[PDB]
Structure formats: C-alpha cells, structure tokens
Amino acid sequence: KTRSSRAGLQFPVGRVHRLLRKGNYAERVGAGAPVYLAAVLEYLTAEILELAGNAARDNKKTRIIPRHLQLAVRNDEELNKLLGRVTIAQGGVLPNIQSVLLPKK
Amino acid sequence: KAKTRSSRAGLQFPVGRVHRLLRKGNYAERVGAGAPVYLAAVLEYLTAEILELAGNAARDNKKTRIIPRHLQLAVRNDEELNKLLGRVTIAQGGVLPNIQSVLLPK
Amino acid sequence: KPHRYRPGTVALREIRRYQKSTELLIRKLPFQRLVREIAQDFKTDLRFQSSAVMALQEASEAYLVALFEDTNLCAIHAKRVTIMPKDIQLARRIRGERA
Amino acid sequence: KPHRYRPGTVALREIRRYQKSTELLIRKLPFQRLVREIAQDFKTDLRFQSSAVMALQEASEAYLVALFEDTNLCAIHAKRVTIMPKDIQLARRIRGERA
Amino acid sequence: DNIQGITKPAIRRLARRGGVKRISGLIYEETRGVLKVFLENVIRDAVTYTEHAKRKTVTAMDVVYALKRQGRTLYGFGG
Amino acid sequence: KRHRKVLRDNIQGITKPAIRRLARRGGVKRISGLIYEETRGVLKVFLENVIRDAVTYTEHAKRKTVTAMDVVYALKRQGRTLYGFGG
Amino acid sequence: GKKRRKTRKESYAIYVYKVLKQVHPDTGISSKAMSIMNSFVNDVFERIAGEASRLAHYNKRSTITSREIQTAVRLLLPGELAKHAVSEGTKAVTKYTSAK
C-alpha cells in the first residue's frame, strides 16, 4: 500500500521523502513533510496543465507544447509572478503592441 | 591543545568556529579539513579590505572611529565591494553626494 | 524689502544637506502607526520589538531614496527636471515591481 | 502606380509576426561561433554539448527581447517611437545591470 | 489618516536625499501608495515568521529575514 | 590534419536583420542606426558572464566538455533560470 | 541489449502525465513541454525545501515537518495559489494521518 494512495495523491510520496533527505535541508525530516510537499507539487502541476490545456485548445491543438505553458503562465497573474524570473525555452512572448505605435487619425 | 588551527594557518579568524558552522549548516554530509581554513582566510581578507577603506573614509572625514557612514562611503566608492554588496543596505549609511549635472544652476 | 531666493536654490541646498547626512527622514511615530496598521490585517494584537520597526524604517527609506534616484533619471530622459508619477511608474516597471 | 506601403506598416506587421511565433531569431551557426569565440578567450580546448549552445541561445534571445520591451518603454516615455542607445542604457541602469 | 502621517515634507526630504530638484504635486499620493505596497510585502512575510515561531511580537530577525527573501538584505540588526 | 581555425569578429555574425527581428518580438516599431552596435555590445557582455560561470562549473567538474547543465547552473545563479534543458 | 547499464535518470514525467489525464483526458504533451514541466517541479521543490531549510534553522529546529513546509508555501506562493496549496496539503496530511 503506497503512501501516495494512502494520502490520496498521484505524486510520489516515497520519492519526495527521499529527495528531502538527500538534499541536506535539515538533520531530520518528519513523515508529514513529504506528504504536504507532494500535494503542493501536484496542485501546481494541475493548475498549469489546466491552463496550458486550454491554450492548446484555444489554438486548435491537442498536444501541449512549450508555447502553451508560456501563454498559460504569462496570462495568469499568479503563476506569472511565481515564475517571474524564469525563462520557458521556445515559449515566445505574449502578443502586445503599445498603443502609441498603432496608426490612427 | 597545542596550537589553535587559526595560528597554524596564520589566521586571526576562528577556524574551529567556521568548521563547526559548516557542519551545523547542512551544506553537505562531510566537510574536509582544508575548507574551514580556506574559508576563514577568505573571510578575514574581505573584512580587512572593508575595514581598510572605511578606516581611510574615517580619516578623510577627520575621524578615528568607524561608523556606518564610513562603511557606506568605503563600499559605494569601490567598484568591486559595491557590486558584491549590490543588493545590500547598510543601515544608517545614507548615500554618496551626487547631483545630476543638468540640475545645476544657470 | 523681503529676501527671496530663486526657485531651485533652496532645493539644491537641501539636496546637499540631505546627501551629506544619514538621519532617518520620516518621523518615527507616523511610521510606527502605519506599520502597525498594515500588520493588523495579517494578524491581530501584535507587538513589535523597537528594533524591528527601526529595521523597517531603514529598509523603507533606503528603498524610497533609491526609487527617487531612478525616478529622477526617468524625468531627465524625458528632458524634464520635475519628477512625476509616470517617472516612478516607469522605474517600477523596468525594475520588475509592476511587471 | 507602383505600390508602396508607408513607413511603419511593414514594421507593425513584423511585430505581429514575431510576437506570434517562437522560433530562434538569430541563425544557429553564427550564434555558435560567437559562443566558441567568447569561451575560447576564457579557456582553450573546450567542447560544447549541442544543447549547451541551444541553452545559451534560448537564454540570450529571451534576454534581448525583454531588454527591447524595456527599451521600447523608455523611448515612449521620451515621446518617441525610435529606440536609441540612450533608451537601452536607461533600461540597463534601472535594471541594475549598470548602476 | 495613517498613510497621510507620511507627510509631504517627509517625502520631499527623501526625494532630496535621492537628488530630486523639483516635484509634481501628484507625487505625494503616488509615493504613499508605493510605500504601502512595500511594507505590505515585507510585513506579510515577517509576520509569517512570527506566526511560525508562535510569538505575538515581531522581532528584528523576522524583519531582517523577510528583507532577505524579498532581496533587500539589511545589515545592522543581526545581533 | 588537426584543424582549429582562428575565431575572430564573430559578434558581427549577429546581423542587422537578426537584431531587427528580436526588437520586433520586443514590440519595437522604429530602430535608430546606432542600436545595432549597442545591441552587439550588450549581448557580448551577457554571454561573457554566462559562459564564464558555465566554464567555471566545467573546470570544477574536471571536464573538457561544457554540458547543458553547466549553462543551466550558470543561468540559475545569475537569476535567469532556464526551463527546457534539464536538472 | 543492455550497454554497461546506464545509471537511472529519474523524473516526475509519469506523475505529470497522470495529472494531465485527469484535467484534460484527450490532451497530449510534447517531450519538450514535459521537459519544461519536469524542470518546474524540481524548481518548486528546491524553492520550498529551501525556505523550509532556513525556517527550521531560524527557530533552532533540526526537523522539517509539514508545518515548516506550510510556512514555506505561504512565504513562496502568491495570494490564491498559497491558499489552495495549503488547503490541498492540509487535506493530504489529514488524509494520510488517519490510516491505521
């Protein structure tokens, strides 16, 4: 009986318990910590896949590509900030032209 | 104890302490004997550099006691410490006198 | 029979004065009130070590002083000598605080 | 009667085009030689995994595009639409890449 | 008031320390907005360090560490 | 047999068209003539800094090959984290 | 078959794929995007583990518990993400602690 299934999680609680030890973050690692972390990690993955999935859909594609992660992240105020110092390879940028540069009159 | 590892290394900074601090910091499973000596010396050097330029700063301003003002002047006047301390605020240090030239009279 | 200095002369004088010193430039109690007011929305009945407020003032004023430096560069770039909200605004965007 | 788009119309069209796509905008080999040249001045007899060079390019293109956004913003603040070395310099100063 | 306790002459002094010569009237409200956003961000985090420590008092360390992770390291309070 | 040529002036490989394309992605409509040389300068400094840290990691590993990971660690320590290439 | 046995290179990709099927059953993912995804997960893990690390230190503690992870999440994620992550994490710990 896995600890993931035991916590109701798709993400690997055993692996996360392990990486927390190998990483030298403290002398000891409580059994709840990996449970919470695997959950948080799965929550965030779900949030971005949700939105990336929509960008793929909005673009008549059925396979998510890095462009889709980028529209997803950059369109979402909170993911954008969490990932404010992060570059997504092959993500491009958001279509955006400053008003003054448009023709009129 | 015969001689402190500091004096073996020729250093005024606490090698023992640094060694202990590297262990309790969970930086790695094991810590080699050399590292605290190397590290202590780097720390001494950087301290000496700052104190050296802040001493100078205290002199110029006709004084014999270093205050945060003098560490600010020392650090911000030095291209290198200034970069190293690019994101640091020294409390009670103020700023370098600077007035944009276009703001000057007439 | 009055003595008036030209506009900018007192300004320049003040700059020279305030760049030469390090005393805090906001008054201690209003700052303290604001700190407590803002903190109250995160947690009620909070107390503050006096050095904890001092730290916040030092960090706050350092931050604003540097923001005025950048703001000033932004005005000058627009051929002005008066700082304006758009200047602060452009500083913060380029700094990545608004972006 | 020979047809000419006015100045700024092909430029706008280009913005749309490149903002739409994600392909690298500097050519591969020229980029690769540049990397090999700069690296060689630090250390001789280096080799690069192909994905090291691809990582350097992806990183350099994202950095340059973003610097242009910040630069564009600096021109517009000066009521221009033409980017100029002083616009890039102001961007880099406020970003702390300079001062 | 409270935010207005940060007075126009205070804001003007800070600007002067930052080398500012002339000042548009709208700057004052803008400066306060900016300050409030700065403190919110720093205080939120410091107060999270307090809550964790099961304290009812914000310590200098709580602030100093909040400033560290905001990328605004302050020296002079780490005793 | 052993080749190796001299590498020099490759920064001019960053062509005017390629700099024009990048500024477009950056939403830039008009470009003054001096921008090209400035951009080359700024790129060169960017690479010098990334490559230098990258090569440091390479040497510390006692390698002669610069890996994607070295670059990725170098970007990471200068606050320009790259996703897409590992670790 | 079998070349001197390459060392295991482990990633979160099978997990990420499961979660994708859950939210978008008919959507696929390129290996580049999967690569981005695996990076993002390692990235957030390191960041949370590191705030947690420091947190523990600061309070003269030598154990990282779910409580350190929680403060870490609150320090690290903005507004609405922190709230829901804390909720999903707490949910999981509770769920876990009530088995046996």
Added chain:
Amino acid sequence: KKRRKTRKESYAIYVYKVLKQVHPDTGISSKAMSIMNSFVNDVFERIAGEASRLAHYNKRSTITSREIQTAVRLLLPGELAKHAVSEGTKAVTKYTSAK
C-alpha cells in the same frame, strides 16, 4: 549566572583584531560592528551555499577546499576573487606545513 546565558556568538572580537592590523590607531562603533558581523555571516552563507551546490552538482558528499575556491571565484568580482584565492591557498599551505 549561567541562566540568561544563551550564548549569542558574533565575529566581533575577530573583526576587532583585524581592525588593529590595518588601522591600529582606529576604532569602531556598535552599529558599525554590527554591520560588519552581518557582512561576515552573509559572505559565509553565500560562499558556503555555493559550495554546497557545487558538491551536489558533482555528486560529492564533501566540501573540500576546492569547493570553497570555485565558490569564491563564482561569487567575488575579478580583483577580490584573485586576492581571496591568494589568501585562501596561502593559509591552507601554511596550515599543512605547520607541525
């Protein structure tokens, strides 16, 4: 009086000693000494932190003097890097070659 004695350690006395070797005629205030303490803790943290990463990137379980060295290279600017590497090698040498 071993009650209220939760020992808080600081680099002060060592900072003080080094002050004498460089300016024997000169002293240093509380606040300044506190600044210096923060400075040393900070550089320790940054260097130790970078060594830790190095060790992990190369699947090592030990921080040797080689790790501190690369760390200093990566962290310190040009000239400061050169001299600190200098001091650092000098002290390890001296220490090896001490009885």
Added chain:
DNA sequence: ATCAATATCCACCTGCAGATACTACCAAAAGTGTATTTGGAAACTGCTCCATCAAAAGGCATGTTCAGCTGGAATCCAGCTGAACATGCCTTTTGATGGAGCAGTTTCCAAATACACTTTTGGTAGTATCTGCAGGTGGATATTGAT
C-alpha cells in the same frame, strides 16, 4: 466614398518525426515490522523591554505670490523605412566517420568520522576609567540676488 493590389486568413490536404504502447528484466526504491533513541511540546518562571501616557519640544499646514518649467504649435530636414536587385562562399541540413572524453565499474588508500578525555576560551556580567565628537559659539568670508 471606389477599389486595386496585396497580405491574411483558415479549412481541407500530406508524410513522417515524434508520440504512445507493447512486453523484458532488475537495481533500487519502497513498504512492513521491531528495537532503541530523542527533538521539541508543553507547562511553569522571571526579568526584559514593550505599550501607555507624563509634559517638553519643535516640525509642519496654511495660502498667497510669482519665476520659470512644461506642453503645445510650428518648421525643417536627415535619418530612417521599404523595396529592388544580385547573390552569398552564407547558412541549413543531412549523414557519415573517427575517436575524444564522459561515464560506469573496480581496487585501495588517505582523510574523515566516531569518541573518549583534557584544556582552553569566548561570552556574559559587572566595575571602573576615560575620551571622540556632536553640538554650541565667535568671526572671517563666500554665495546670492537686488541693484
């Protein structure tokens, strides 16, 4: 306003690069159980240093007047865009080759951990000596703005 000359769209095609699904075997990872140890909650304690308000101190809100900075308008021209034309020795791309060097496996020793026992020392806690300089002044002189 017509419209002609392009660019732009987007829905229906293709051929394959790349995604998903076989089953293989297995080192490692993960679970389950058992004995042995321990960090930290939790309950109480005191003395530190925090919120409160004494009155003593002194910065600032107010408004009116006016210099000068700002944005608006007008003119001029050169520096930029668009596009045509000629042609990379240019770049992409494909694919093959030889072998550099990275990475996996083994053997084995030097440097690290573990630990007990000894000796030192940095921090705290006073107690007393003393001094650097912040702030007050007097008097020369430099700056400013009105003539």
Added chain:
DNA sequence: ATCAATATCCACCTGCAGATACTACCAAAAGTGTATTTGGAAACTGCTCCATCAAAAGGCATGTTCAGCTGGATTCCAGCTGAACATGCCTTTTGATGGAGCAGTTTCCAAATACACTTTTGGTAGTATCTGCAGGTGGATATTGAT
C-alpha cells in the same frame, strides 16, 4: 559692475554617551590521541556524442543602394504649477512605570532513526505501430494606400 543679507566655513570649547580595560565564573568549544569507516582518486575501457567535412538548395535571407516620407530635433512661447516663505498649534518625542510575553528550564513521550528481510516499481531497453500537425496549396475574405 556695487553690495547688503545670509549661508557656510573654521577653530575652539565642554560634557557625556558609549567606548575601552581588567577580573571572575563557566558551558561548551576546541583540540589531542587512537581505533574504524568510507568517499573518492586512480587505472581501465565501453560507448556516447562532438567535431568536421561534403555538397546540395531542400535557395533561403542577406548586404547594398537609393528614394523620399515623416519622426525627431529645434525654437518659441503662454499660462499653469510648483517653490519659496513665515510661525502658531497641534502632533511627535522624550521622559516614567507597570506587566506581557520572550526566553530560559526541565520533564517525558510521540515520533524519529536504525536496521532486516521482502515486495514492488519506475527506468529503460527496444521494436512494434498509430496520429497530430508542419508545410503545401488554393481559393475565398481582410487591409492599405491611391485617388
């Protein structure tokens, strides 16, 4: 230019906050010596992948020039908007005093680590096999610039 009004500078002064100096008591920090363990350097070597050349087009996208449009640079100028200014009063500060709660202590157990079979699984390896979509084309709708 002349020149009064003020700011700014400089030596000199005292008093006291905060520096230093010297002693005493002590947990814990630091080394010393000595059996025990283990990470990583060393030598060998399989197998990945990097450099490099080839030769075509899959020929694209570049460099060069040249016209002439218009944004940027300049000059001028009217009014709007910040700076300067002066001091009573009203808010800050600097003092005084309980008491909240941080920080210290010590008791104890729920949960951590250690260690041993025993089980399960994700990585990988390698063919075997669909499928989404890049790039093509055409042919119908969208825009720009000339009248």
